[PDB]
Amino acid sequence: TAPVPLDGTYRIEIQRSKQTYDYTPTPQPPDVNTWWAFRTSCTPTECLAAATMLDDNDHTQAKTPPVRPFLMQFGEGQWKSRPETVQFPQATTQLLALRPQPQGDLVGEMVVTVHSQQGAVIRIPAVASRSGDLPPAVTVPDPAT
């Protein structure tokens, strides 16, 4: 029941054409694809994954300017990033949940909970698919550091 580690180049699609506002559809196309270099380190109790953003066209180089890496923790059968406060056209909490599919890719959603329209939950479906190994040029920060 330990998860498959997230290691290699991953393509994340935030499908904003399926965005919902309290389960009621509010489509905002187009979907947005980004590329990330994932590395995973597991202790006997937890598995953590760190992802550094790659450039949009050249996925062998980190994004310019540098973007801070985000972390995911596997628990309750899913990878979930820690909630982070983000300003919205109001203060929100935004996180990414990715559930491993039997096949190898991951399906989940981006969850944006509003705290200041104060209280709704914006859900955007998300897909993550592995695109080969890591870029040997990029250095992904080990989450066990």
UniProtKB/Swiss-Prot annotation:
Autophosphorylated at serine and threonine residues. Changing residue 30 to G: Favors the presence of monomers in solution. It is found in: Cytoplasm; Cell membrane. One of its GO terms (cellular component) is plasma membrane. Disruption phenotype: Mutants show increased growth within macrophages and a hypervirulence phenotype in severe combined immunodeficiency mice. Belongs to the protein kinase superfamily. Ser/Thr protein kinase family. Several structural motifs known to be critical for the activity of eukaryotic-like Ser/Thr protein kinases (ePKs) are severely degraded in PknI. No kinase activity was detected by Lisa et al. for the catalytic domain of PknI, against different substrates and in various experimental conditions, suggesting that PknI may rely on unconventional mechanism(s) for kinase activity and/or it could play alternative role(s) in mycobacterial signaling. Plays an important role in slowing down the growth of mycobacteria within the infected host. Activates the peroxidase activity of Rv2159c in a phosphorylation independent manner during oxidative stress conditions and thereby maintains the cellular homeostasis. This is Serine/threonine-protein kinase PknI. It comes from Mycobacterium tuberculosis (strain ATCC 25618 / H37Rv). The chain holds residues 402 to 560 of 585 of the full protein.
